[PDB]
Design an enzyme around this catalytic site. Structure first.
Site, PDB file in Angstrom:
ATOM      1  N   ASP A  73      -0.257  -7.611   1.453  1.00 43.19           N
ATOM      2  CA  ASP A  73       0.235  -6.232   1.481  1.00 43.19           C
ATOM      3  C   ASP A  73       1.765  -6.189   1.555  1.00 43.19           C
ATOM      4  OD1 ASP A  73       0.010  -3.462   1.399  1.00 43.19           O
ATOM      5  OD2 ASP A  73      -0.330  -3.254   3.549  1.00 43.19           O
ATOM      6  N   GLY A 108       2.798   6.434   8.586  1.00 39.51           N
ATOM      7  CA  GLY A 108       4.145   6.546   8.035  1.00 39.51           C
ATOM      8  C   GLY A 108       5.132   5.551   8.615  1.00 39.51           C
ATOM      9  N   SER A 128       4.311   2.119   8.690  1.00 39.46           N
ATOM     10  CA  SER A 128       4.115   0.826   8.032  1.00 39.46           C
ATOM     11  C   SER A 128       5.385   0.436   7.296  1.00 39.46           C
ATOM     12  CB  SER A 128       2.941   0.841   7.051  1.00 39.46           C
ATOM     13  OG  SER A 128       3.222   1.615   5.898  1.00 39.46           O
ATOM     14  N   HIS A 138       0.820  -1.216   0.000  1.00 41.53           N
ATOM     15  CA  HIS A 138       0.000   0.000   0.000  1.00 41.53           C
ATOM     16  C   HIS A 138       0.856   1.270   0.000  1.00 41.53           C
ATOM     17  CE1 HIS A 138       0.191  -0.120   4.512  1.00 41.53           C
ATOM     18  NE2 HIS A 138       0.086   1.189   4.379  1.00 41.53           N
TER      19      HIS A 138
HETATM   20  C1  LIG Z   1      -1.995   4.179  10.922  1.00 40.76           C
HETATM   21  C2  LIG Z   1      -0.866   3.593  10.549  1.00 40.76           C
HETATM   22  C3  LIG Z   1      -0.954   2.301   9.885  1.00 40.76           C
HETATM   23  C4  LIG Z   1       0.340   1.389   9.697  1.00 40.76           C
HETATM   24  C5  LIG Z   1      -0.295   2.134   8.433  1.00 40.76           C
HETATM   25  N1  LIG Z   1      -1.060   1.282   7.591  1.00 40.76           N
HETATM   26  C6  LIG Z   1      -2.357   1.653   7.059  1.00 40.76           C
HETATM   27  O1  LIG Z   1      -2.721   2.720   7.000  1.00 40.76           O
HETATM   28  C7  LIG Z   1      -3.150   0.450   6.448  1.00 40.76           C
HETATM   29  C8  LIG Z   1      -3.380   0.409   4.868  1.00 40.76           C
HETATM   30  C9  LIG Z   1      -4.491  -0.253   4.758  1.00 40.76           C
HETATM   31  O2  LIG Z   1      -4.389  -1.597   5.005  1.00 40.76           O
HETATM   32  C10 LIG Z   1      -4.104  -2.408   3.889  1.00 40.76           C
HETATM   33  N2  LIG Z   1      -3.919  -1.913   2.718  1.00 40.76           N
HETATM   34  C11 LIG Z   1      -3.704  -2.677   1.701  1.00 40.76           C
HETATM   35  C12 LIG Z   1      -3.624  -4.030   1.773  1.00 40.76           C
HETATM   36  O3  LIG Z   1      -3.339  -4.839   0.667  1.00 40.76           O
HETATM   37  C13 LIG Z   1      -2.732  -4.267  -0.435  1.00 40.76           C
HETATM   38  C14 LIG Z   1      -3.829  -4.619   3.012  1.00 40.76           C
HETATM   39  C15 LIG Z   1      -3.785  -6.007   3.193  1.00 40.76           C
HETATM   40  C16 LIG Z   1      -4.019  -6.535   4.430  1.00 40.76           C
HETATM   41  C17 LIG Z   1      -4.240  -5.714   5.494  1.00 40.76           C
HETATM   42 CL1  LIG Z   1      -4.499  -6.450   7.037  1.00 40.76          CL
HETATM   43  C18 LIG Z   1      -4.283  -4.362   5.325  1.00 40.76           C
HETATM   44  C19 LIG Z   1      -4.072  -3.800   4.060  1.00 40.76           C
HETATM   45  C20 LIG Z   1      -5.402   0.343   5.800  1.00 40.76           C
HETATM   46  N3  LIG Z   1      -4.396   0.493   6.929  1.00 40.76           N
HETATM   47  C21 LIG Z   1      -4.715   0.666   8.330  1.00 40.76           C
HETATM   48  O4  LIG Z   1      -3.930   0.714   9.116  1.00 40.76           O
HETATM   49  C22 LIG Z   1      -6.259   0.706   8.586  1.00 40.76           C
HETATM   50  N4  LIG Z   1      -6.563  -0.270   9.539  1.00 40.76           N
HETATM   51  C23 LIG Z   1      -7.020  -1.564   9.119  1.00 40.76           C
HETATM   52  O5  LIG Z   1      -7.415  -1.728   8.032  1.00 40.76           O
HETATM   53  O6  LIG Z   1      -7.167  -2.430  10.187  1.00 40.76           O
HETATM   54  C24 LIG Z   1      -7.487  -3.794  10.014  1.00 40.76           C
HETATM   55  C25 LIG Z   1      -6.497  -4.547   9.164  1.00 40.76           C
HETATM   56  C26 LIG Z   1      -7.428  -4.486  11.346  1.00 40.76           C
HETATM   57  C27 LIG Z   1      -8.872  -3.831   9.416  1.00 40.76           C
HETATM   58  C28 LIG Z   1      -6.687   2.091   9.066  1.00 40.76           C
HETATM   59  C29 LIG Z   1      -6.373   3.119   8.031  1.00 40.76           C
HETATM   60  C30 LIG Z   1      -8.184   2.047   9.303  1.00 40.76           C
HETATM   61  C31 LIG Z   1      -5.951   2.404  10.339  1.00 40.76           C
HETATM   62  C32 LIG Z   1       0.605   3.329   7.661  1.00 40.76           C
HETATM   63  O7  LIG Z   1       1.228   3.948   8.396  1.00 40.76           O
HETATM   64  N5  LIG Z   1       0.465   3.468   6.342  1.00 40.76           N
HETATM   65  S1  LIG Z   1       1.338   4.607   5.707  1.00 40.76           S
HETATM   66  O8  LIG Z   1       0.972   5.741   6.177  1.00 40.76           O
HETATM   67  O9  LIG Z   1       2.637   4.435   5.979  1.00 40.76           O
HETATM   68  C33 LIG Z   1       0.943   4.597   3.970  1.00 40.76           C
HETATM   69  C34 LIG Z   1       2.072   3.885   3.306  1.00 40.76           C
HETATM   70  C35 LIG Z   1       2.063   5.346   3.339  1.00 40.76           C
END
Ligand SMILES: C=C[C@@H]1C[C@]1(NC(=O)[C@@H]1C[C@@H](Oc2ncc(OC)c3ccc(Cl)cc23)CN1C(=O)[C@@H](NC(=O)OC(C)(C)C)C(C)(C)C)C(=O)NS(=O)(=O)C1CC1
Ligand SMILES: [Cl-]
Ligand SMILES: [Zn+2]
Length: 192
Positions: free
Chosen positions: A93, A149, A151, A69
């Protein structure tokens, strides 16, 4: 559509974890477009960026892993030009490239420890209690904004081995009481 660019790194070795910025947001345009990055990589965890978003990538078993992602299907910039993904699994992911030359990889944990530690993009190290194969509980709840940020970063055991890659926050009305991660065993299965 350009390459993922390394803009910093997080050190986990020695006694003190720390973050170092190596490239400014303004700018990574040339490196993105060309996929040619002059910088020699260090450390176990890279701070990486696309056009407007930043996240982390972690070297384990000679592969630099991150989240789909964040990376999508992008190449990563390197001194020899753009490096194509070694592994891609949209369901998990998960993205992996061959670990950059000069990188240090973490070893996969086989401790079976319940006490984990999540490393954030600011090199904060926060305790996580394991609660299932791909989940751990935060001892203190955090706004999701705190974890954004981070992840692609590691969950470590007490001895500093890799237990997993931070994937998603388990969010209850904008507050994370737990974290979802890709366990190192799943990385191994992807490498089968
Ligand atoms: C808050 C910080 C969290 C760590 C972080 N990751 C997130 O935002 C993730 C992204 C998204 O999840 C997924 N996408 C694509 C997938 O496949 C391609 C997935 C395949 C399997 C699974 Cl598991 C999830 C997947 C939604 N999500 C959440 O965390 C979501 N949570 C979530 O969905 O929770 C459950 C999994 C428990 C439902 C939510 C947004 C609601 C918090 C981050 O920091 N990102 S980032 O900023 O760096 C961005 C890269 C620039
Ligand atoms: Cl760079
Ligand atoms: Zn361990």
């Amino acid at each position: 559509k350009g390459s993922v660019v390394i803009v910093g790194r997080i050190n986990l070795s020695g006694d003190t974890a720390y973050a170092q910025q190596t490239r400014g947001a303004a700018a990574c345009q040339e490196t993105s477009q060309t996929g040619r990055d002059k910088n020699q990589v260090e450390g176990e965890v890279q701070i990486v960026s696309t056009a407007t978003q930043t996240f982390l990538a972690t070297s384990i078993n000679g592969v630099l892993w991150t989240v789909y992602h964040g990376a999508g299907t992008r190449t990563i910039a390197s001194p020899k030009g753009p490096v194509t993904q070694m592994y891609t699994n949209v369901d998990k992911d998960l993205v992996g490239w061959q670990a950059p030359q000069g990188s240090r990889s973490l070893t996969p944990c086989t401790c079976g420890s319940s006490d984990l530690y999540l490393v954030t993009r600011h090199a904060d190290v926060i305790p996580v209690r394991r609660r299932g194969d791909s989940r751990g509980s935060l001892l203190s709840p955090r706004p999701i904004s705190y974890l954004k940020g981070s992840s692609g970063g590691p969950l470590l055991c007490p001895a500093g081995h890799a237990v997993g890659i931070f994937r998603a926050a388990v969010s209850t009305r904008g507050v994370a009481k737990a974290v979802d991660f890709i366990p190192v065993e799943s990385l191994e299965t992807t490498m089968r």
